[PDB]
Amino acid sequence: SMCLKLNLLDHVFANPFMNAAGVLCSTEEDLRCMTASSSGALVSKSCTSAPRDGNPEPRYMAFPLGSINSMGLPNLGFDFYLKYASDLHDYSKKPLFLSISGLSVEENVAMVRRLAPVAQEKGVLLELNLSCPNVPGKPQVAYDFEAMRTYLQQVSLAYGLPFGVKMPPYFDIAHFDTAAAVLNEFPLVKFVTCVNSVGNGLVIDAESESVVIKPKQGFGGLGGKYILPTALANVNAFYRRCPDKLVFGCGGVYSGEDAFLHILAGASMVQVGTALQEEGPGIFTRLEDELLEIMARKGYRTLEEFRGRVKTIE
Amino acid sequence: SMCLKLNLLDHVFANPFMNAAGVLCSTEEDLRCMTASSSGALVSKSCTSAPRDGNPEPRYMAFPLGSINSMGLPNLGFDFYLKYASDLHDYSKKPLFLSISGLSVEENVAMVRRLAPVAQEKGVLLELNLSCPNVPGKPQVAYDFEAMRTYLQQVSLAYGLPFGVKMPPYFDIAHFDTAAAVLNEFPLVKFVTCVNSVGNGLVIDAESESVVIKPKQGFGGLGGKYILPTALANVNAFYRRCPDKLVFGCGGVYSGEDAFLHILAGASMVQVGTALQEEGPGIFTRLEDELLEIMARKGYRTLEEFRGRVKTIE
Ligand SMILES: Cc1cc2nc3c(=O)[nH]c(=O)nc-3n(C[C@H](O)[C@H](O)[C@H](O)COP(=O)(O)O)c2cc1C
Ligand SMILES: Cc1cc2nc3c(=O)[nH]c(=O)nc-3n(C[C@H](O)[C@H](O)[C@H](O)COP(=O)(O)O)c2cc1C
Ligand SMILES: O=C(O)c1ccc2cc(CCCCc3c(C(=O)O)[nH]c(=O)[nH]c3=O)ccc2c1
Ligand SMILES: O=C(O)c1ccc2cc(CCCCc3c(C(=O)O)[nH]c(=O)[nH]c3=O)ccc2c1
Ligand SMILES: C[As](C)(=O)[O-]
Ligand SMILES: C[As](C)(=O)[O-]
Ligand SMILES: C[As](C)(=O)[O-]
Ligand SMILES: C[As](C)(=O)[O-]
C-alpha cells in the first residue's frame, strides 16, 4: 500500500506494469505515448534487421474474451529502435526494454552486437523473442529445445550482458522441466517473460461463417481472457524452476486482481497486451489503483510480501 | 424440413451431440443417464485395465470461463465398461463409444484385443485417448510423435477394426503437420476428436491466495470458454490435413452457436464437456433447438450443407 515502486535488474521502477511487446510500441509516437503513461516501464515492438510491413489486414481482432493476431512482425527495423534507445528515450521517466526477433540466429547475433554498447551506455534492456515465422518441417525455436540452446549460446556470447527471454506457453510438465533447464544453463538470462500468445487459435464469426483475420487462413495467436490460467501456470512453473532469475508475467491482465494473481504466481513485472490495445494507456492508472486496493484490503505493504506465495492445498 | 441426423461409421445418429469423455460417464448410473438424454451418442469414461480411485479432492473446479481438472483417471476398470458395452447398453437408443486410456502400450493392446469381438458383435466404437502419460518425465503420448506412432501401430494390429483417437490441442503449425501425417499412416483411424483439455493451466483464487485443485500443485487441464478458439483451430487443422477421416469437435461448446462454429470448422460429432458438467444433460435439448434455429435463419437444412465450409478472407 502507499506506493508500488520496485528495483530490478539494476533499475528502479515506479510500479510493476508495462506494455506487452507489440502493443502500443511500434512507432516513435507509440513509444512516446507509453513513456508518457503511468506504466513502470515500456518495451518496444519486436524488431528485425530490416523494416517490415507485416501481413495483410485484417490481422488483429478483439472480442469480449480476448484477441487473435497474425501481425507478421510489422516493425520499423532495428536501426529505428536502436536510435530510439540511444537518442530519443527519456530514461529519467522509466526504463526501456528493446525486443528483438530476427528471422535467423545470425540476424539476432548481428543486432545484439549493436545493441550492447547502447545497453552499457544508456541501460536499455534486451528482451529476446524466442517465438518464430512458420518454416514447413520446423517448430518455433522455443519449441525445439536444441535449437533454443544454440540461440542462447550465440546470443549470450555475442551480447555479453544481462538479458531476458520472451517464451511461448508450454502445456506439458516435461516441457517445463526441459525448457527451464535450458534457460538455467545461461547465467546472462536474468528474466523470463511468460507468455507470448497461445499459438494458432482460430476465431470464427457465426453470422458471416468466416474467419476474422486474413493471414494464415484465420489462424493466429490468442491473448486476453482466454489465456490467463495458461499464463499463470507458465509464470509459476518457471518461478519454481528458475530461482536465480526473475519471471515477468504476461497474459490475460485486465485488472489489478489479475495482476495480483500473476505476482502471487511469481511475477516481478506484469505486462499488458490485449487489454492495453483495447483500453488504451489509461489502463495503467486503473491497474495501479486496483492493485493497491487489493493490497490494502489484505494488509500487504509490499509486492515482496506476496510474490510467489500462491498457496497449494495440503 | 431441417434435420440434425448423421450417418457415419456405419451408425445413425439423431443429432451430432454427445458428452465429452470423462463427463457424466463413469458409472452405470451416469451411462444410463446419458442414454436417457437427448444426445445423439455417448462415450464412456477413459478406462484402465484395473479400477482407479484417481487423485485426491478437490480435483475439478468450474468458473464462469471454464473448468480445471486433474482427475487422475478415476474409473471402474475395463471389465466394467466392456460389460456395459456387451450386456447393458441399449443400442436402440443411440450409439456408444468406449474410451480407453491405458498407461502403457501393452495395457492398451490388452484392452483392445478384448474389445474387438464386442465391437464386431454390438457395434460399440473405440475412442483411444492419446493424452495418456507413458514414461513419467516424458511428454504425454500425443506430444511424443514416436510414441504416438508406436501406440497406433500396436493398437491397429491388435484391434483390426475402425477406431478413433482423442487428441490434445497443438499450438504450432509444424505440430499440426507432423501429427496429421502420423495419423494418416493408419487407415483404421477413422475419426479424430479434437481436443482434450488444454494442459497444465493454473487457476488461482484471489481471496484465498490459493490454487483451486489439490493435485499437481494446482496445475490441471482447462476446458470451457477458455479453449473454444484453440479447439476450433485444431478441428479445422485436422479437417484440412486428414481428408479421409472424420473429425469430431470438443472444446468450449456451451450453445448451438458454438456447435455451429465447430461444424463449420469441420466437425462431424460435437462433444460437450465442461458445459454438460455444469448444466447437466438437459443441455442437449437446448443445443439441438439452438442449432436448428441458426440453421433456420440461414436456410440450411442439413449439417452437410455447412460442415467444413468456414470461409477464409481472400
Ligand atoms: C497485436 C499484437 C502484437 C504483438 N506483437 C508481439 C511482439 O512484437 N513481440 C512479442 O514478444 N509478443 C508480441 N505479442 C504478444 C504479446 O506481447 C503478449 O505476449 C500476448 O498478447 C499475451 O498477453 P495479453 O493476454 O495481455 O494480450 C503481440 C500481441 C498482440 C495482441
Ligand atoms: C472432469 C473431466 C474429466 C475428463 N476426463 C477425460 C477422460 O476420461 N478422457 C478424455 O478423453 N478426456 C477427458 N476429459 C477432457 C474432455 O473430454 C474434453 O476434451 C475437455 O474437457 C474439453 O471440452 P470442454 O471445453 O467441453 O470441457 C475430461 C474433462 C473433464 C472436465
Ligand atoms: O507470413 C505470415 O503469414 C507470417 C505469419 C506470422 C509470422 C510470425 C513471425 C514471428 C512473430 C513474432 C512477433 C509476434 C507477433 C507478430 O508480430 O505477429 N504476434 C504475437 O502474438 N507474438 C509475437 O511474438 C514472423 C513471420 C511471420 C509470417
Ligand atoms: O496415479 C498416477 O500415477 C497417475 C497415472 C496415470 C495418470 C494418467 C492421467 C491421464 C488422464 C487421462 C484422462 C483425462 C483426465 C483425467 O482423468 O484426469 N482429464 C482430462 O482433462 N483429460 C483426460 O484425458 C492422469 C493422471 C494420472 C495419474
Ligand atoms: C498503436 As499502432 C497501429 O502503431 O500499434
Ligand atoms: C495473513 As495477512 C496479515 O496478509 O491477512
Ligand atoms: C456424475 As460423476 C461423480 O460419476 O462424473
Ligand atoms: C469428399 As470427402 C468429405 O470424402 O473428403
Side-chain angles (χ1 to χ4, degrees), chain A residues 24 37-38 276 279-287:
Chain A
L24 193 59
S37 88
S38 74
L276 171 59
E279 186 170 331
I283 195 169
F284 291 111
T285 57
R286 184 176 62 78
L287 294 177

PDB file of all heavy atoms in Angstrom, chain A residues 24 37-38 276 279-287:
ATOM      1  N   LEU A  24       1.179  -0.968 -28.602  1.00  0.00           N
ATOM      2  CA  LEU A  24       1.490   0.459 -28.402  1.00  0.00           C
ATOM      3  C   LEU A  24       2.991   0.737 -28.321  1.00  0.00           C
ATOM      4  O   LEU A  24       3.499   1.381 -27.390  1.00  0.00           O
ATOM      5  CB  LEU A  24       0.719   0.999 -27.150  1.00  0.00           C
ATOM      6  CG  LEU A  24       0.684   2.510 -26.966  1.00  0.00           C
ATOM      7  CD1 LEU A  24       0.043   3.206 -28.139  1.00  0.00           C
ATOM      8  CD2 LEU A  24      -0.114   2.840 -25.700  1.00  0.00           C
ATOM      9  N   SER A  37       2.680   7.609 -20.248  1.00  0.00           N
ATOM     10  CA  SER A  37       1.747   6.893 -19.431  1.00  0.00           C
ATOM     11  C   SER A  37       2.322   6.645 -18.021  1.00  0.00           C
ATOM     12  O   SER A  37       3.439   6.905 -17.740  1.00  0.00           O
ATOM     13  CB  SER A  37       1.419   5.561 -20.080  1.00  0.00           C
ATOM     14  OG  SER A  37       2.337   4.512 -19.706  1.00  0.00           O
ATOM     15  N   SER A  38       1.459   6.157 -17.175  1.00  0.00           N
ATOM     16  CA  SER A  38       1.850   5.851 -15.828  1.00  0.00           C
ATOM     17  C   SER A  38       2.504   4.467 -15.626  1.00  0.00           C
ATOM     18  O   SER A  38       2.745   4.071 -14.557  1.00  0.00           O
ATOM     19  CB  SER A  38       0.671   6.032 -14.900  1.00  0.00           C
ATOM     20  OG  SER A  38      -0.207   5.019 -15.060  1.00  0.00           O
ATOM     21  N   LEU A 276      -4.557  -3.495 -22.976  1.00  0.00           N
ATOM     22  CA  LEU A 276      -3.982  -2.185 -23.331  1.00  0.00           C
ATOM     23  C   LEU A 276      -4.336  -1.793 -24.740  1.00  0.00           C
ATOM     24  O   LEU A 276      -4.691  -0.624 -24.980  1.00  0.00           O
ATOM     25  CB  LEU A 276      -2.463  -2.230 -23.166  1.00  0.00           C
ATOM     26  CG  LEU A 276      -1.683  -1.058 -23.674  1.00  0.00           C
ATOM     27  CD1 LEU A 276      -2.082   0.260 -23.026  1.00  0.00           C
ATOM     28  CD2 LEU A 276      -0.199  -1.319 -23.552  1.00  0.00           C
ATOM     29  N   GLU A 279      -8.146  -0.822 -24.295  1.00  0.00           N
ATOM     30  CA  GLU A 279      -8.470   0.297 -23.407  1.00  0.00           C
ATOM     31  C   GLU A 279      -7.647   1.522 -23.574  1.00  0.00           C
ATOM     32  O   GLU A 279      -8.100   2.629 -23.277  1.00  0.00           O
ATOM     33  CB  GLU A 279      -8.436  -0.166 -21.944  1.00  0.00           C
ATOM     34  CG  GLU A 279      -8.898   0.867 -20.881  1.00  0.00           C
ATOM     35  CD  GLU A 279      -9.047   0.233 -19.519  1.00  0.00           C
ATOM     36  OE1 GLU A 279      -9.348  -1.005 -19.503  1.00  0.00           O
ATOM     37  OE2 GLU A 279      -8.970   0.960 -18.507  1.00  0.00           O
ATOM     38  N   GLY A 280      -6.437   1.397 -24.030  1.00  0.00           N
ATOM     39  CA  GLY A 280      -5.526   2.480 -24.142  1.00  0.00           C
ATOM     40  C   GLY A 280      -4.733   2.632 -22.875  1.00  0.00           C
ATOM     41  O   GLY A 280      -4.955   1.993 -21.858  1.00  0.00           O
ATOM     42  N   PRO A 281      -3.784   3.583 -22.899  1.00  0.00           N
ATOM     43  CA  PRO A 281      -2.785   3.686 -21.824  1.00  0.00           C
ATOM     44  C   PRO A 281      -3.279   4.189 -20.464  1.00  0.00           C
ATOM     45  O   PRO A 281      -2.611   4.070 -19.467  1.00  0.00           O
ATOM     46  CB  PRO A 281      -1.734   4.644 -22.423  1.00  0.00           C
ATOM     47  CG  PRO A 281      -2.453   5.447 -23.423  1.00  0.00           C
ATOM     48  CD  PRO A 281      -3.472   4.483 -24.031  1.00  0.00           C
ATOM     49  N   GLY A 282      -4.514   4.739 -20.458  1.00  0.00           N
ATOM     50  CA  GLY A 282      -5.188   4.998 -19.243  1.00  0.00           C
ATOM     51  C   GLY A 282      -5.320   3.779 -18.343  1.00  0.00           C
ATOM     52  O   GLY A 282      -5.464   3.886 -17.094  1.00  0.00           O
ATOM     53  N   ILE A 283      -5.292   2.570 -18.940  1.00  0.00           N
ATOM     54  CA  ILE A 283      -5.403   1.375 -18.161  1.00  0.00           C
ATOM     55  C   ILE A 283      -4.396   1.330 -17.023  1.00  0.00           C
ATOM     56  O   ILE A 283      -4.634   0.764 -15.933  1.00  0.00           O
ATOM     57  CB  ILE A 283      -5.288   0.091 -19.001  1.00  0.00           C
ATOM     58  CG1 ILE A 283      -5.753  -1.108 -18.258  1.00  0.00           C
ATOM     59  CG2 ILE A 283      -3.862  -0.105 -19.546  1.00  0.00           C
ATOM     60  CD1 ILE A 283      -5.908  -2.334 -19.154  1.00  0.00           C
ATOM     61  N   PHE A 284      -3.210   1.933 -17.225  1.00  0.00           N
ATOM     62  CA  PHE A 284      -2.139   1.794 -16.185  1.00  0.00           C
ATOM     63  C   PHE A 284      -2.479   2.452 -14.863  1.00  0.00           C
ATOM     64  O   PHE A 284      -2.149   1.939 -13.814  1.00  0.00           O
ATOM     65  CB  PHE A 284      -0.806   2.267 -16.723  1.00  0.00           C
ATOM     66  CG  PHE A 284      -0.251   1.360 -17.802  1.00  0.00           C
ATOM     67  CD1 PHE A 284      -0.154   1.740 -19.134  1.00  0.00           C
ATOM     68  CD2 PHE A 284       0.187   0.096 -17.468  1.00  0.00           C
ATOM     69  CE1 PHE A 284       0.333   0.885 -20.072  1.00  0.00           C
ATOM     70  CE2 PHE A 284       0.648  -0.780 -18.442  1.00  0.00           C
ATOM     71  CZ  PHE A 284       0.718  -0.355 -19.696  1.00  0.00           C
ATOM     72  N   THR A 285      -3.208   3.562 -14.888  1.00  0.00           N
ATOM     73  CA  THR A 285      -3.562   4.196 -13.625  1.00  0.00           C
ATOM     74  C   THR A 285      -4.571   3.339 -12.950  1.00  0.00           C
ATOM     75  O   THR A 285      -4.594   3.204 -11.709  1.00  0.00           O
ATOM     76  CB  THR A 285      -4.093   5.650 -13.755  1.00  0.00           C
ATOM     77  OG1 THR A 285      -5.248   5.665 -14.626  1.00  0.00           O
ATOM     78  CG2 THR A 285      -3.034   6.610 -14.300  1.00  0.00           C
ATOM     79  N   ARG A 286      -5.530   2.764 -13.650  1.00  0.00           N
ATOM     80  CA  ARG A 286      -6.564   1.855 -13.145  1.00  0.00           C
ATOM     81  C   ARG A 286      -5.918   0.619 -12.518  1.00  0.00           C
ATOM     82  O   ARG A 286      -6.273   0.191 -11.417  1.00  0.00           O
ATOM     83  CB  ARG A 286      -7.612   1.502 -14.207  1.00  0.00           C
ATOM     84  CG  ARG A 286      -8.697   0.661 -13.638  1.00  0.00           C
ATOM     85  CD  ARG A 286      -9.780   0.377 -14.624  1.00  0.00           C
ATOM     86  NE  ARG A 286      -9.388  -0.399 -15.850  1.00  0.00           N
ATOM     87  CZ  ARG A 286      -9.198  -1.721 -15.900  1.00  0.00           C
ATOM     88  NH1 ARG A 286      -9.348  -2.436 -14.803  1.00  0.00           N
ATOM     89  NH2 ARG A 286      -8.923  -2.320 -17.046  1.00  0.00           N
ATOM     90  N   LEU A 287      -5.025  -0.029 -13.237  1.00  0.00           N
ATOM     91  CA  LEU A 287      -4.401  -1.240 -12.711  1.00  0.00           C
ATOM     92  C   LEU A 287      -3.621  -0.903 -11.428  1.00  0.00           C
ATOM     93  O   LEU A 287      -3.666  -1.691 -10.469  1.00  0.00           O
ATOM     94  CB  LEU A 287      -3.424  -1.784 -13.766  1.00  0.00           C
ATOM     95  CG  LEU A 287      -4.029  -2.294 -15.048  1.00  0.00           C
ATOM     96  CD1 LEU A 287      -2.997  -2.737 -16.041  1.00  0.00           C
ATOM     97  CD2 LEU A 287      -4.892  -3.504 -14.787  1.00  0.00           C
TER      98      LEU A 287
END
